[PDB]
Assembly symmetry: D2
Homo-oligomer: 124 residues x 4
């Protein structure tokens, strides 16, 4: 339903690139390249979306994860984005995210960052 | 993967939910989640990522995963992402924070996302 | 005394159409009223919070937060929101926040007691 | 006047060993001091917040929140924390919270300005 719509190349307000393919079964797979932080080149992402959403004008729920390890860098961290795809003229993926990095137990209290990313198909 | 063995297997949270996961050598997480609460019945597909080469200073291993709450029985038009870290040892744990987003209209988007925290252990 | 006391004091507006009226004290206090354009809210609610009255000099923002409990002389939504964020000065002064809204639940329902979001405030509607 | 005014008023301790000393006013006010056992913090910091002074009578918790800006006479960590949560009274009284900690950043570093966590406070040390 929203498979073709979600599938494609997305950019957030930071200039990050999210290249994703939505599967018929609810899979999300692709690559993420962050414009910020301890990150270089593309990282693997996987996630899930609701492949049969409400038809009442509601968005499509989805989420995905990046672990920040590739051949170039390892930031000992993972980000999860949770949010919704909104179709139509101004297609957009509005998210909140959590970034956890590996800490000792004594440091676990400041292990997790929160933020928000909005993605569109136009590079801003 | 340094914790591929420690992570793979069955986990239980404070609410009585069950998470079965395989951790791949390449940083993949795949499995199923069965929730003890909410609009949830039976198992749901889970996918995520973990750091397959963590620090060796006693830091945890960062990870995350997504469940979209659609299976053959039920569709709650929502998805949860868990972001956290695995901590090995006698009392292995996965400590997470999570975001649950449900599909909303634009007018209801301000209240589309819940936040919480779950701790998983290997013992029921 | 307070470095951004002048910049923060006044009326702010968010992306929802809500209105935040605040006074920053020299001692770090935030006092004022919040009027929400959405939810189980009517008219103005008391707000109280704190800000860093001696921020860093290097162009960093000024950290702040405040709370609104959603009870007033009209309604009681058995809930409270906290906003955490920073004030950025200049033209297009802004207060960029993340928020948590907790509502009172039984223990059985506490897992879904807390919403999260983000609000941006500017001096112009 | 407040339903849980006496229940909330007093000293609370979290899982980190931090100490929260609070007075609940009749009108919904929270005032007091916070002393963190961790981070760039020393001694007591001013807190202010709000609680629902007339909660539901169905065994629901009492929604509340408060803010600390991490500046006192000893130290300034250019940051503020807000706790959003609920009070549950009775045998083992507890305040269960989620929190947001924002530190002052430049605009380029704003994306990593806010930490999130959860604290549970009880009356015992
Ligand atoms: O820097 C990294 C790795 C890359 C994160 C990129 C983030 S993910 C959310 C946001 N959205 C984007 O597009 N980019 C940013 N990890 C790390 C480790 C320890 C502390 C901190 S702050 C960060
Ligand atoms: O109920 C569901 C689907 C199942 C969620 C289970 C949650 S995921 C985080 C936590 N950890 C667990 O183990 N279980 C819970 N979605 C939904 C949609 C719209 C509004 C609401 S309130 C809920
Ligand atoms: O509706 C209310 C009372 C008013 C909340 C207004 C919010 S505060 C963050 C955001 N920013 C604004 O300006 N407005 C909104 N409480 C309540 C209780 C139970 C469930 C839910 S969803 C909501
Ligand atoms: O360190 C401080 C000042 C004290 C924070 C204490 C926290 S508040 C939530 C939690 N609950 C407690 O009881 N204690 C902790 N600020 C600061 C600035 C920049 C980055 C970071 S990580 C931290």
């Amino acid at each position: 339903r929203d498979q073709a719509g979600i599938t494609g190349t997305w950019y957030n307000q930071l200039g990050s690139t999210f290249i994703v393919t939505a599967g018929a079964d609810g899979a999300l797979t692709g690559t993420y390249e962050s414009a910020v932080g301890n990150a270089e080149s593309r990282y693997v992402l996987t996630g899930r979306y609701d492949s049969a959403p409400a038809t009442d004008g509601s968005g499509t729920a989805l989420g995905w994860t990046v672990a920040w390890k590739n051949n170039y860098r390892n930031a000992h961290s993972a980000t999860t984005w949770s949010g919704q795809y909104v179709g139509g003229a101004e297609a957009r993926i509005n998210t909140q995210w959590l970034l956890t990095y590996g800490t000792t137990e004594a440091n676990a209290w400041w292990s997790t960052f929160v933020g928000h990313d909005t993605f569109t198909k136009v590079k801003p």
